[model samples]
Target: EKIRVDIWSDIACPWCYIGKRRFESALGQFPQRDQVEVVWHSFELDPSARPLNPIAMRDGLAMKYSISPAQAQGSLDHMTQTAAQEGLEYHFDRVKLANTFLAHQLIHYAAEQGQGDAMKERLLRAYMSEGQNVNDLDTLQKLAAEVGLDAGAARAALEAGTYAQAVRYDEAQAQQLGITGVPFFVLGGKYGVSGAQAPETLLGALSQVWAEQHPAPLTMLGDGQCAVP
Candidate 1:
């Protein structure tokens, strides 16, 4: 009785962060929480940002989306308001818009060590609320060690590009799945709930899927097939 879920999202996306909180609220209501397998996939808000220079690289999204920071903030404010409903504090002032390529790689590496879920939360906290230089190796190493990893080994692994391919694979899968946004949850790989939905909705979806997958087992003790007296 296990439900498989794959969530596509990026660490740098504000709405993705909010969406995660909402999903958590939903998961809390799921009766069979232990019967779920959750996996986080890589999905960039800005795909053209490879080896990204957050300030300099403003051609694609900036031109097509916004010309000034105020426009961006207005949209972010709306998301912040929504996030507050889910008990999430959005600190836009401390938020640093950066490329998450390396972050995704580190998450993939953590997953290999069975620490993906915890690592994801730590990274989100560090980037969203905590004032840390996310692009710096010192910060990344410290965060990794804090999450039960050997600091020296984590640094070396990042430098050696150990989990690069796995991160790339995640990105490829996101594209194949046709996921264009964050917080996209695929339930048992069949039913997809997009955006940050209410906890009740998510819980209902889980229950529906669970009931369909695992029906009541029939007990045949005194039947002809059982050969009982």
Candidate 2:
């Protein structure tokens, strides 16, 4: 039996990256990992955000949460430390807020080509670590190509908005499912692990789902004969 794990996340979400690493670690340790299918979905942290503003990440966070820049920096610093523990080097100085719709569209295109997960990974790293502008179609095209996608096709898809509806469809489904946050992991259509949960928690959830799907059959000992000592 195959288990499907749908993860909803955004490129701009720091916790999403952490959650991804933790979930991946758990999945890697699953005994039936070969039977697991992982899919990435779109969730914009700031759908109304526009590109080219070039604002610092601290300023962006402060504005979004109505907190002071100093407070935002404290939060970011904490996140940076957490991400480092996950083997991810997040360059907060290089971080910038951008509209991720086009980036999301590119992901849908990559999905069609069976590289959705790879594209998602690249996008997250590009935005969170390399300071790449995800909203730039040309830049996104480069990233897409780096992930083995056809550069021309990816660019064409972005230019024509080919996968816009696919992105919207995922977003709409997320809303219907009452998912208001990123890093939400849905397992086996029932279990949901929200936020950057510990690897043990995710591993436990995976085991629980797998066991439910493939319950062990009762075995008859000694041909169902009673044992006497």
Candidate 3:
């Protein structure tokens, strides 16, 4: 059986993308890499925001966190540099404030179509790298098409809010688990790792858990009967 890794993240979260890269690195080195299953779960950092607020991300962050614009820029710069180390391009200056609820629902919709990972990667790249407006259904449909998903189907899903409940269920589960952060990873439904940990740390956790779950079988001297020596 494959080990399931459930990830709770938001597309707008910079650290989530970093964590994704680090996690992927660890998984690449894992012995049972092919036996690992990854599932993306929905989490919204700012659920009350609108799709298009016309406010820059720096200003939005400043207002939301009660910080100065300079401080927000500082955070963005730090994140940008950190993302660079992982080979990810982050254009925070052009980032617009977005409500990710619909995007999360679209992720669920993509999951049903067996394109969940592609959809998630495209959304992250769209918001972080390309500076595209992920909350806009038109933009999202275009991105979905790029990932080989049916654009009309994605549009229909968005119009009908088809996967909204699934998105909410993920959020509810996160709340129930006392998870208040993105980039959270749950391994085999037992071990939970929060934040973007180092690749070595993530790899260590994977090895230890896999060892525990699949212990060495005992060897018997006799085939039919087991006797104490």
By TM-score, how accurate is candidate 2? Answer: 0.93
**Which candidate comes out best when scored by lDDT?**
2
Over 108-140, each residue of candidate 2 has an lDDT whose tens digit, in order, gives 999989999899999999999999999988799
The clash number for model 1 is 0
Q: Comparing candidate 1 with candidate 2, which one achieves the higher TM-score?
A: 2
What digit string (tens of lDDT, one per residue) describes model 1 on residues 80-180? 78878767676766666666777777788788889988888888888776755566677889999999977798888888888878878888887888877
TM-score each candidate.
0.85, 0.93, 0.93
Q: Model 1: clashing residue pairs?
A: none
Report residue 125 deviation for candidate 2 (angstroms).
Answer: 0.7
Summarize candidate 3's per-residue lDDT along 16-127 as a digit string, tens digits. 9999999999999998889888999999887777877888878888997899999999988999999999999898878867889888988888888898998999899999
Q: Which stretches of candidate 2 lie over 4 Å from their true place?
A: 219-229
lDDT per model vs. reference: 0.77, 0.91, 0.90
